[PDB]
Design a protein around this ligand. Structure first.
Ligand SMILES: *C(=S)NCCCCCCCCCCCC
Ligand SMILES: [Zn+2]
Length: 277
């Protein structure tokens, strides 16, 4: 069927306000973090000049051999703060309002957790920095963020005190976490809305999630560029694209839903609180 009254942000807002919209899944990427200062890497180079090919800084095999590049960049690009964005806190609001079924994230910055999404709400599709593991299969010693953070800027390779210690991120050529496949099996059977934010759906198998929803489920993309989705054909019925930055899009949606002050209120204290530390 066709559930949206209009293929626009406004039509999506009206749907979200209705009794029909009970379960929402968010699929998110780099764009939701860029106003928090987290680097994108969708489309960088000069800084890397000191690797056999550029992408190998993000590659599993090279990492095991030559870990220090990656760890050097991690120091270079380490945010001085971790302030979740308007977009992160919009998902927090969905959680508070009993709408958020799951957030599938391509991001490794831990900002969803900081905005108050719980483990059960999240599928960290590309792993996380929140926790790091010894590569030794007979050991697999676990170390926290603060140990990994402290090691990284000391420009020393992190090593296991019992045995290399890797952040739990999925490097190119590495298979995705079990939790991705188990959640995806049931999450999409009964979902009323997909909110796709800050991703161009370029990485697989993350990109395939959008086709998992029922044919009737509306899908809103909030992204800098267009990116199974049919926004513009004579047969378009359920997909809407809002092009621009994620913070501005979520703000416009919040404003349409009557959540603008609420969202603003949430961001202000959460930020000012983080400041105090
Ligand atoms: C896959 S699309 N993304 C998951 C992140 C792991 C692969 C890229 C490594 C990023 C370099 C780390 C920069 C330090 C902030
Ligand atoms: Zn170990």
């Amino acid at each position: 069927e066709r559930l949206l009254d209009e293929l626009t942000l406004e039509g999506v807002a009206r749907y979200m306000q209705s009794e029909r919209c009970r379960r929402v899944i968010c699929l998110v990427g780099a764009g939701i973090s860029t106003s928090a200062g987290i680097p994108d890497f969708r489309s960088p180079y000069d800084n890397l000049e000191k690797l056999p090919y550029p992408e190998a800084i993000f590659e599993i095999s090279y990492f095991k051999k030559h870990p220090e590049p990656f760890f050097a960049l991690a120091k270079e690009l380490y945010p001085g703060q971790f302030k979740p964005t308007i977009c992160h806190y919009f998902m927090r609001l969905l959680k508070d309002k009993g709408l958020l079924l799951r957030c599938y994230t391509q991001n490794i910055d831990t900002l969803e957790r900081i905005a108050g999404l719980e483990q059960e709400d999240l599928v960290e599709a590309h792993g996380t920095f929140y926790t790091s593991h010894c590569v030794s299969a007979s050991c697999r010693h676990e170390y926290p963020l603060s140990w990994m953070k402290e090691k990284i800027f000391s420009e020393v390779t992190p090593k296991c005190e019992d045995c290399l210690v890797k952040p739990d991120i999925v490097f190119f050529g590495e298979s995705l976490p079990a939790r991705f496949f188990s959640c995806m099996q049931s999450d999409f059977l009964k979902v009323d809305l997909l909110l796709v934010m800050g991703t161009s759906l370029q990485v697989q198998p993350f990109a395939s999630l959008i086709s998992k929803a029922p044919l009737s489920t509306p899908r809103l993309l909030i992204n800098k560029e267009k990116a199974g989705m049919d926004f513009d054909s004579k047969k378009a019925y359920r997909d809407v694209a809002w092009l621009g930055e994620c913070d501005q899009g979520c703000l416009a949606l919040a404003e349409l839903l009557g959540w603008k002050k609420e969202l603003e209120d949430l961001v202000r204290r959460e930020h000012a609180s983080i400041d105090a530390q």
